[PDB]
Write a protein that binds this ligand. Structure first.
Ligand SMILES: Nc1ncnc2c1ncn2[C@@H]1O[C@H](CSCC[C@H](N)C(=O)O)[C@@H](O)[C@H]1O
Ligand SMILES: Nc1ncnc2c1ncn2[C@@H]1O[C@H](CSCC[C@H](N)C(=O)O)[C@@H](O)[C@H]1O
Lengths: 220, 220
């Protein structure tokens, strides 16, 4: 099945996504730096870019930078004078991400903050940051419950929240699993349901990265 | 396999989509009337509703009504004096859709036009309809090329176009397919690539309806 899903994704990108030497280099540098290949796929990246454009987002919060691949897709969807604030725990990942954001000529609208996301989120609250209108949660999924609460806290009515990798090859329905990622993801779904101010759905996806999925939520 | 995808969708729906007796009735009536089970899934329907809300769409065009299941999800995403115009070739389907839409108390927001979509689209242009901000193509896929051209013609900068069922169990990559629906979808991808005014991506999805996918495009 992975061969078929990968072939379909190759077809989709070949026809709908013009070759982009900049983004290809980002992945190449990530690999050279030994960063894991956990970036969103090209089709997922374009989905994010287009969703940002549909929302007309101007203040994006991303949790989990890696090498800035998703960050570039997101930043490219920004309105006028919008910006992206992305959080990364690894000093090395963050350094590489900054270099890739530089190679994409987006350093004028993207800020990479190094440190554990929970600590950075508190700092963001402490500082004078306007509410975020688009939030992409893509870090350590075991912490999704806390990231969701922070996302809502730092949101405004109409804010879009995308939570990546929330199906995990179907492990999401294994209620007895002792895996913290699975339990964290399940609590993420539950907390969204508990919040009357948030309405969401989740689509299961397949492609070059395998069988997974994402949550798309909107703050009332 | 399909068992896992179905179970995951059941989980997602159970937690994120509150029970809706109105929509349950809609599907029951569609089935009693022997309509094919081609309605979007509940999670796909909510995805459409949320996307409509994110864009803040006010004038929706849907091609392919069936029993009005997707139509209701779309209409529920509207707010002010928003409207939905949906096209259906089957007189029987159209009347069942009008009935379901009425039971959902949305007849004031939805217009179901009976007839071949290509004929109705010409009429819509002839008439003074305002440009459509959101277009859902979900009828006979062999005609997607023509529907895409009409969508572009009746759009405005920023219009969102969603094309459903564009992966079809992975057959979309088979250029030699004897399925006119597969050829129609391939023609659709190609035309999008040939239209500079449209940027798109496609995500492959799995769930209760099986392995398929959708295209999301934005008009520039
Ligand atoms: N507690 C935490 N705070 C911030 N980043 C964290 C974290 N735990 C893990 N991460 C970071 O989560 C990232 C997940 S991969 C991020 C990929 C990126 N969104 C893309 O599309 O390419 C990694 O870079 C990892 O170092
Ligand atoms: N040429 C044409 N013009 C208009 N509708 C057409 C058509 N060819 C097929 N259809 C209609 O396409 C519909 C596809 S199923 C539509 C389902 C609907 N989107 C939902 O989510 O519930 C059927 O009702 C079929 O009768």
């Amino acid at each position: 099945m992975i061969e078929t899903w990968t072939a379909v994704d190759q077809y989709v990108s070949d026809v709908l996504i013009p070759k982009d030497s900049t983004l290809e280099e980002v992945l190449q540098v990530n690999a050279a730096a030994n960063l894991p290949a956990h970036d969103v796929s090209p089709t997922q990246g374009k989905f994010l870019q287009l969703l940002v454009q549909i929302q007309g987002a101007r203040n994006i919060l991303e949790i989990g930078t890696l090498g800035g691949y998703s960050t570039i897709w997101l930043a490219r969807g920004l309105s006028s004078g919008g910006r992206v604030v992305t959080l990364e725990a690894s000093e090395k990942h963050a350094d590489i991400a900054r270099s890739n954001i530089e190679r994409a000529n987006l350093n004028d609208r993207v800020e990479v903050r190094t440190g554990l996301a929970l600590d950075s989120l508190q700092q963001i609250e402490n500082e004078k940051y306007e509410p975020f209108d688009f939030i992409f949660i893509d870090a350590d999924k075991q912490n999704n419950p806390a990231y969701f609460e922070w996302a809502l806290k730092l949101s405004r009515p109409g804010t879009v929240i995308i939570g990546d990798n929330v199906v995990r090859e179907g492990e999401v329905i294994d209620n007895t699993s002792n895996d913290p990622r699975v339990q964290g993801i399940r609590r993420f779904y539950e907390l969204i349901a508990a919040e009357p101010r948030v309405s969401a759905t989740a689509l299961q996806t397949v492609g070059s990265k395998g069988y997974d999925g994402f949550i798309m939520a909107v703050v009332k």
